[PDB]
Symmetry: C2
Subunit: 144 residues, 2 copies
């Protein structure tokens, strides 16, 4: 049965070669409008639990170069620091310009982002977006 689950891990593979940071995640909206993990590596189960209900959201990247110099809640923040995360990249996934979810990169030390990384990161998010668009779609259609 259809495994975009294999595409998610593939993308996690590609993120870690392409962008050489310590962990990564993919999340997508559920019907409630809340972002949910569909794929991770290697953030712990304890962190993903803490955070699952909480992030979002015209669709552009977001970079926390240091969680300290960062306007988060002290609640959310100790979760992040607790996991051993010092920096974060948020990268939108879209269909038809609809925000559909995001992927995330995580760093143990603070981090500044090159144009080249951001570019690769954007190309990754582009492909996932289309992968999900096409896999979802004609599984919708291989029915009618």
């Amino acid at each position: 049965s259809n495994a975009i689950e294999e595409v998610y891990e593939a993308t996690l593979d590609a993120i870690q070669g392409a962008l050489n940071c310590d962990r990564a995640s993919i999340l997508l909206f559920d019907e409630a409008g809340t972002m949910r993990f569909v794929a991770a590596r290697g953030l712990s189960e304890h962190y993903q639990r803490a955070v699952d209900g909480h992030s979002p959201w015209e669709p552009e990247p977001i970079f926390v170069e240091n969680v300290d110099d960062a306007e988060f809640s002290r609640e959310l923040k100790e979760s992040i620091v607790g996991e051993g995360i010092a920096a974060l990249g948020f990268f939108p996934l879209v269909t038809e310009g609809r925000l559909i979810g995001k992927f995330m990169t995580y760093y143990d030390r603070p981090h500044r982002f090159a144009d080249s990384e951001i570019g690769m990161a954007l190309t990754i998010a582009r492909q996932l977006g289309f992968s999900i668009q096409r896999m979802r779609a004609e599984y919708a259609r291989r029915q009618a």
Copy 2:
């Protein structure tokens, strides 16, 4: 029900959006060791039948660029095949899984073209992601045995 002909089409989507070239394709090895189109746009079938075979490589592969066909190292026949298709420039990016060549994906340009570092980086990125998508997706199909 491996319709990840959808992974191929998505890739072709990403190739177009990330690299603004004129045409693109994916080719994979077959059991005779020969390279074979598995997806493309807008190459013609005539072209595709025409040029199966050549694998610019044979254990540690880099991208190959051809900025002007007229200035490339091609046998008469194979240069005639490209130009008659209407192509002037091409990019070969190896597809690799577990440290081995499995295929390639190609960007084509109808007029000469110098390859900007940025687009090379983008292209490589996509080439990794195809590799990995293939690695994992047939891995799943095989597992179920």
